[PDB]
RNA sequence: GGGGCCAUGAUCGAGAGGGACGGCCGGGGGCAUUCGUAUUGCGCCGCUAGAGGUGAAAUUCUUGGACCGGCGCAAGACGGA
């Protein structure tokens, strides 16, 4: 089995699935939900991430990638740490599309102590 | 102005305090260092067209390579759990 590393930037307003080699140096294939939907409002929807990892499996099989290490990633830093809605739809679409998954681990950029986050002391009053 | 004489003259030790002293204790304070990232900026490597953001949209960034992945580099805040 040709092991790989799959970087899933599961955040809000967009969902990224980035498949690279074992070192993460060369990008084998990467797509976004906006590449499959007409309106950018449906980017964070799990249906867009469902179509994203689907065609990725073909590009992984065409080049020879069979297994993919899951590297789940949220926005991190000052912003939220919980991954977006595409964290599970893209992960399930990867295994269901005839691939292999192994050694799942999430890498979210959590800071020891960040700077002042966007929005004042009163917070985003939406 | 020399002795004698007196039970010869100082109550303490505050469920007040000061200070000493012993083992400490604590995000008390000043200053100098160590470290952790992250945000942001830049270079290189790799692939691709949208990406940022929003309830939705747009400004904005984008085949002058944006966003994203790695190796890095630099500066300034902050000191999470």
Automatic annotation (TrEMBL):
<comment type="subunit">
    <text>Component of the small ribosomal subunit. Part of the small subunit (SSU) processome, composed of more than 70 proteins and the RNA chaperone small nucleolar RNA (snoRNA) U3.</text>
</comment>
<feature type="compositionally biased region" description="Basic residues">
    <location>
        <begin position="117"/>
        <end position="126"/>
    </location>
</feature>
<dbReference type="GO" id="GO:0048821">
    <property type="term" value="P:erythrocyte development"/>
</dbReference>
<dbReference type="GO" id="GO:0043249">
    <property type="term" value="P:erythrocyte maturation"/>
</dbReference>
<keyword id="KW-0689">Ribosomal protein</keyword>
<keyword id="KW-0687">Ribonucleoprotein</keyword>
<dbReference type="GO" id="GO:0003735">
    <property type="term" value="F:structural constituent of ribosome"/>
</dbReference>
<protein>
    <recommendedName>
        <fullName>Small ribosomal subunit protein uS11</fullName>
    </recommendedName>
</protein>
<comment type="similarity">
    <text>Belongs to the universal ribosomal protein uS11 family.</text>
</comment>
<comment type="function">
    <text>Component of the small ribosomal subunit. The ribosome is a large ribonucleoprotein complex responsible for the synthesis of proteins in the cell. Part of the small subunit (SSU) processome, first precursor of the small eukaryotic ribosomal subunit. During the assembly of the SSU processome in the nucleolus, many ribosome biogenesis factors, an RNA chaperone and ribosomal proteins associate with the nascent pre-rRNA and work in concert to generate RNA folding, modifications, rearrangements and cleavage as well as targeted degradation of pre-ribosomal RNA by the RNA exosome.</text>
</comment>
<dbReference type="GO" id="GO:0022627">
    <property type="term" value="C:cytosolic small ribosomal subunit"/>
</dbReference>
<dbReference type="GO" id="GO:0043009">
    <property type="term" value="P:chordate embryonic development"/>
</dbReference>
<dbReference type="GO" id="GO:0006412">
    <property type="term" value="P:translation"/>
</dbReference>
<dbReference type="GO" id="GO:0000028">
    <property type="term" value="P:ribosomal small subunit assembly"/>
</dbReference>
<feature type="region of interest" description="Disordered">
    <location>
        <begin position="106"/>
        <end position="126"/>
    </location>
</feature>
């Amino acid at each position: 089995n040709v092991f790989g590393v799959c970087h899933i930037f599961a955040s809000f307003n967009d969902t990224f699935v980035h498949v690279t080699d074992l070192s993460g140096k060369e990008t084998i294939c990467r797509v976004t939900g906006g590449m499959k939907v007409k309106a950018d409002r449906d980017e964070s929807s799990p249906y867009a991430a469902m179509l994203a990892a689907q065609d990725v499996a073909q590009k992984c099989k065409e080049l020879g990638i069979t297994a993919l290490h899951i590297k789940l990633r949220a926005t991190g830093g000052n912003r939220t740490k919980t991954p977006g809605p595409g964290a599970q739809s893209a992960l399930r679409a990867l295994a269901r599309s005839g691939m292999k998954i192994g050694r799942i681990e999430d890498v979210t950029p959590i800071p020891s102590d960040s700077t002042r986050r966007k929005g004042g002391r009163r917070g985003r009053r939406l």
